[PDB]
Design an enzyme around this catalytic site. Structure first.
Site, PDB file in Angstrom:
ATOM      1  N   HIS C 125      72.564 -56.431  42.453  1.00 17.88           N
ATOM      2  CA  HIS C 125      73.665 -55.477  42.351  1.00 17.88           C
ATOM      3  C   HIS C 125      75.010 -56.164  42.146  1.00 17.88           C
ATOM      4  O   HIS C 125      75.264 -57.235  42.706  1.00 17.88           O
ATOM      5  CB  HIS C 125      73.721 -54.592  43.600  1.00 17.88           C
ATOM      6  CG  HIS C 125      73.902 -55.353  44.876  1.00 17.88           C
ATOM      7  ND1 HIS C 125      75.144 -55.674  45.380  1.00 17.88           N
ATOM      8  CD2 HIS C 125      72.999 -55.860  45.750  1.00 17.88           C
ATOM      9  CE1 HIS C 125      74.998 -56.345  46.509  1.00 17.88           C
ATOM     10  NE2 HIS C 125      73.706 -56.471  46.756  1.00 17.88           N
ATOM     11  N   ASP C 126      75.856 -55.538  41.330  1.00 17.08           N
ATOM     12  CA  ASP C 126      77.240 -55.977  41.090  1.00 17.08           C
ATOM     13  C   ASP C 126      77.394 -57.374  40.470  1.00 17.08           C
ATOM     14  O   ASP C 126      78.479 -57.962  40.513  1.00 17.08           O
ATOM     15  CB  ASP C 126      78.090 -55.833  42.360  1.00 17.08           C
ATOM     16  CG  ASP C 126      78.235 -54.388  42.804  1.00 17.08           C
ATOM     17  OD1 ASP C 126      78.868 -53.595  42.074  1.00 17.08           O
ATOM     18  OD2 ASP C 126      77.717 -54.048  43.887  1.00 17.08           O
ATOM     19  N   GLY C 143      73.687 -60.852  45.275  1.00 24.93           N
ATOM     20  CA  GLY C 143      74.704 -59.835  45.005  1.00 24.93           C
ATOM     21  C   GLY C 143      76.082 -60.380  44.672  1.00 24.93           C
ATOM     22  O   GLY C 143      76.495 -61.411  45.201  1.00 24.93           O
TER      23      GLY C 143
HETATM   24  C1  LIG Z   1      69.786 -57.672  52.993  1.00 24.85           C
HETATM   25  C2  LIG Z   1      71.089 -57.033  52.508  1.00 24.85           C
HETATM   26  O1  LIG Z   1      71.311 -55.837  52.699  1.00 24.85           O
HETATM   27  N1  LIG Z   1      71.921 -57.871  51.885  1.00 24.85           N
HETATM   28  C3  LIG Z   1      73.229 -57.462  51.341  1.00 24.85           C
HETATM   29  C4  LIG Z   1      74.326 -57.667  52.402  1.00 24.85           C
HETATM   30  O2  LIG Z   1      74.312 -59.019  52.910  1.00 24.85           O
HETATM   31  P1  LIG Z   1      75.073 -59.416  54.272  1.00 24.85           P
HETATM   32  O3  LIG Z   1      75.384 -60.861  54.222  1.00 24.85           O
HETATM   33  O4  LIG Z   1      76.160 -58.451  54.555  1.00 24.85           O
HETATM   34  O5  LIG Z   1      73.881 -59.206  55.331  1.00 24.85           O
HETATM   35  P2  LIG Z   1      73.846 -57.931  56.306  1.00 24.85           P
HETATM   36  O6  LIG Z   1      74.977 -58.050  57.248  1.00 24.85           O
HETATM   37  O7  LIG Z   1      73.688 -56.693  55.511  1.00 24.85           O
HETATM   38  O8  LIG Z   1      72.487 -58.225  57.115  1.00 24.85           O
HETATM   39  C5  LIG Z   1      71.308 -57.420  56.975  1.00 24.85           C
HETATM   40  C6  LIG Z   1      70.373 -57.634  58.179  1.00 24.85           C
HETATM   41  O9  LIG Z   1      70.512 -59.005  58.651  1.00 24.85           O
HETATM   42  C7  LIG Z   1      70.945 -58.999  60.041  1.00 24.85           C
HETATM   43  N2  LIG Z   1      71.900 -60.139  60.193  1.00 24.85           N
HETATM   44  C8  LIG Z   1      73.176 -60.084  59.592  1.00 24.85           C
HETATM   45  C9  LIG Z   1      74.072 -61.141  59.721  1.00 24.85           C
HETATM   46  C10 LIG Z   1      73.712 -62.274  60.448  1.00 24.85           C
HETATM   47  O10 LIG Z   1      74.504 -63.207  60.561  1.00 24.85           O
HETATM   48  N3  LIG Z   1      72.446 -62.353  61.052  1.00 24.85           N
HETATM   49  C11 LIG Z   1      71.534 -61.290  60.927  1.00 24.85           C
HETATM   50  O11 LIG Z   1      70.429 -61.379  61.464  1.00 24.85           O
HETATM   51  C12 LIG Z   1      71.543 -57.611  60.296  1.00 24.85           C
HETATM   52  O12 LIG Z   1      71.298 -57.220  61.652  1.00 24.85           O
HETATM   53  C13 LIG Z   1      70.766 -56.708  59.336  1.00 24.85           C
HETATM   54  O13 LIG Z   1      69.580 -56.203  59.963  1.00 24.85           O
HETATM   55  O14 LIG Z   1      75.626 -57.354  51.839  1.00 24.85           O
HETATM   56  C14 LIG Z   1      75.990 -58.251  50.754  1.00 24.85           C
HETATM   57  C15 LIG Z   1      77.444 -57.961  50.347  1.00 24.85           C
HETATM   58  O15 LIG Z   1      77.637 -56.552  50.182  1.00 24.85           O
HETATM   59  C16 LIG Z   1      74.989 -58.117  49.586  1.00 24.85           C
HETATM   60  O16 LIG Z   1      75.259 -59.119  48.601  1.00 24.85           O
HETATM   61  C17 LIG Z   1      73.526 -58.255  50.054  1.00 24.85           C
HETATM   62  O17 LIG Z   1      72.654 -57.809  49.011  1.00 24.85           O
END
Ligand SMILES: CC(=O)N[C@H]1[C@@H](OP(=O)(O)OP(=O)(O)OC[C@H]2O[C@@H](n3ccc(=O)[nH]c3=O)[C@H](O)[C@@H]2O)O[C@H](CO)[C@@H](O)[C@@H]1O
Ligand SMILES: CC(=O)N[C@H]1[C@@H](OP(=O)(O)OP(=O)(O)OC[C@H]2O[C@@H](n3ccc(=O)[nH]c3=O)[C@H](O)[C@@H]2O)O[C@H](CO)[C@@H](O)[C@@H]1O
Ligand SMILES: CC(=O)N[C@H]1[C@@H](OP(=O)(O)OP(=O)(O)OC[C@H]2O[C@@H](n3ccc(=O)[nH]c3=O)[C@H](O)[C@@H]2O)O[C@H](CO)[C@@H](O)[C@@H]1O
Lengths: 262, 262, 262
Positions: C125-126, C143
């Site tokens: 995406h993006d 992403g």
């Molecule tokens: C898997 C997913 O949705 N990935 C998206 C997310 O990544 P991003 O890096 O934001 O990862 P998320 O915060 O969405 O994490 C998704 C999962 O990982 C867990 N978690 C998160 C952080 C951490 O340090 N440890 C951990 O265990 C969270 O509890 C959750 O269950 O947003 C990015 C920016 O918009 C996108 O590029 C990615 O495609």
């Protein structure tokens, strides 16, 4: 028996014996074997192959070119009627493969609920995936692998055979996991080594300050104390007396057979 | 001409000129080009694409979403009628790709017999795979690559272009092979380095105690002696006088063009 | 509206609203959604899924088992009508996945022209892919990733989220890119580190001797000088005064947000 409220696209082939539940979607060019069971609201987008003795729960989204319940890649397997079980609300992406188990290993490949299996994630024979787990693009689970609840396996990461990934673990991308990984920890590299506790994940999932601090003490006992495992096992067991979240360690130790990553 | 004992599923498309042998299975949604030849008892499960000048032997199991005989990924290729040859009893798994050769490189991609090509194993243009080889999940062979008999390439392992994997070799998982790998050896890492002799494999396949010990002496001459290759070449050649299994080294040296892994 | 000179195979399903251009090929078992636009001479070989708000240009070759315009793998995404744009003459190989963007990130995944997306290359995406780029087998873009013109990403290489791959860059095989990569440079390893300038690529694409030598001076200022980025930024800016090819650096610096690979 197919429920009278389920949609079977005229181009899709469903063999007799396959029980499809209410409001399920079987998209075009999908193949559903005679021993397959599909639950309520489960969607097979298109070009999906589901065969063998395969039980699938409710509200699942199985995408194109996915192959579920297929014959496994163990050379010992000779065509025995083994089993596959998938839970509820799982998002199974494109080109994902979940295989049937083997007689030698238990005869069952098991997948829990609310999991996300990203593009080309492989689940081999006799594997056991828990709840709310994430396997990123190209994440490969070898035979007899346990992935406990809330565990995240990054892109292009092969978890080696018999290995157990603990609850709330995060294995980073491009990693190679050759041994058992204790709950709550971060794993990076090839072979994978520990890099502290998943402090972010536990905070997001609602663990108390006391529990997170106690888990880190258990980590300090395991990796940072300078004692062997037999010396720290009973010390963790009595740390778990006050903090029930540390019990995940002692339960894990009984299941561990390949040793810890260090 | 299609044999009168072969099964062509009514949804599968087979072009005119495609010769299908006796008792062959062409599953639903399969595409077989006009220059394709399919032998006795060969099964195309479903959703299989076979095109180009492609010759396929007997008793093969080609799984769903596999693409065989397709146009290769060389930028020099312009649409020339090149060739693909596959032997007997090969198990070609899901999403596997075997491409046609190029005019510049010989015009032929060749696959032997009794091989297992696990999920998403790629065989590029002008490649040559021998007999009873195993390519695990995501194992990628680049252009002009030779994989000799009984060789095992682990998961997510890219063998670089022009490289030769010797007979009875085992390249470990997550490896990067940038140079030629001599027969009988273990290769791990990225870039891949040697780690002794495949002692287990040779014992299982029925090599005598003398032969295994002689092969290890040849390994000691190559990697452990402290001499260059030109000095150990004729010493291996006369070691092969008593032990015919050491001849595999001297034959390999004539074919090697990228140098050995060290 | 489907043009009267385009070929839609009787087994392929095209929803109403999908505008297909003149002389386009929609092969067997292809699915084209109601919001999809396909241009002149674009070929969908077979078993291709194109859905969502997806705009596709002219003379494209989209191969079997490719999934274009599909729902992305961001957990935040909830089904919003986002967009996908693909340019002209792109060769999209087997099992390749190009996803729709997210509302949070801009709502658009963009692919340029004359690119080669080799087997199982993923575009998340993006993402923004430029012109004449090459993504080899299993190359995964996370992403929000920008891949500028003429950039080459080798096999099994995951470019991490938000990262930018500069123009004329070559990231080697099996690499892990965790930060921004400046234009013209070679990147190898995991995490990826710089290894000089792509001297070959610039010579083949027609850069003058002065320009290549000036680019190498800019590289020397960035990585070899011993100064920080803020000190070398304005020195590069006035080096670009004489040599317009060095302007690619200063333009890149404004877009860079993750820092340089070192
Ligand atoms: C898997 C997913 O949705 N990935 C998206 C997310 O990544 P991003 O890096 O934001 O990862 P998320 O915060 O969405 O994490 C998704 C999962 O990982 C867990 N978690 C998160 C952080 C951490 O340090 N440890 C951990 O265990 C969270 O509890 C959750 O269950 O947003 C990015 C920016 O918009 C996108 O590029 C990615 O495609
Ligand atoms: C490819 C295969 O079937 N793998 C399965 C096998 O792995 P396992 O580790 O048992 O590997 P195998 O012993 O089946 O080896 C398969 C092939 O590799 C060769 N070989 C074996 C050992 C060795 O050290 N060197 C060597 O070259 C053998 O000759 C044979 O041709 O059983 C495991 C436990 O039930 C399963 O998780 C695996 O899915
Ligand atoms: C992508 C491609 O077609 N690969 C084929 C090519 O590889 P080969 O190693 O020859 O790579 P090419 O020279 O074809 O390079 C293709 C692209 O990479 C650029 N470039 C090339 C060299 C360099 O050092 N830096 C650089 O950036 C070129 O400008 C071109 O745009 O021929 C080999 C031998 O016939 C085949 O095995 C490969 O399948």
């Amino acid at each position: 028996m197919i429920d009278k409220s389920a949609f079977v696209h005229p181009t899709a082939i469903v063999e007799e014996g396959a029980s499809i539940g209410a409001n399920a979607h079987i998209g075009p060019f999908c193949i559903v074997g005679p021993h397959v069971e599909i639950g309520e609201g489960t969607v097979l987008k298109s070009h999906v192959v589901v065969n063998g003795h395969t039980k699938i729960g409710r509200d699942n989204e199985i995408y194109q070119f996915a192959s579920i319940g297929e014959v496994n890649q163990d050379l010992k397997y000779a065509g025995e009627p083994t089993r596959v079980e998938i839970g509820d609300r799982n998002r199974i992406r494109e080109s994902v493969t979940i295989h049937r188990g083997t007689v030698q290993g238990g005869g069952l490949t098991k997948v829990g609920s609310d999991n996300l299996l990203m593009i080309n994630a492989h689940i081999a024979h006799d594997c056991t995936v828990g709840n709310r787990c994430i396997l990123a693009n190209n994440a490969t689970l070898a035979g007899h692998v346990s992935v406990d609840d809330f565990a995240i396996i990054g892109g292009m990461t092969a978890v080696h055979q018999f290995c157990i990934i603990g609850a709330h673990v995060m294995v980073g991308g491009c990693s190679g996991v050759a041994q058992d990984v204790p709950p709550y920890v971060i794993a990076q590299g090839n072979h994978a080594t520990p890099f502290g506790v998943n402090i972010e994940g536990l905070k997001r999932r609602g663990f108390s300050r006391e529990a997170i601090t106690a888990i880190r003490n258990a980590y300090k006992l395991i990796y940072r104390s300078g004692k062997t495992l037999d010396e720290v096992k009973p010390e963790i067991a009595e740390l778990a007396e006050t903090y029930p979240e540390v019990k995940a360690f002692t339960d894990f130790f009984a299941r561990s057979t390949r040793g810890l990553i260090r």
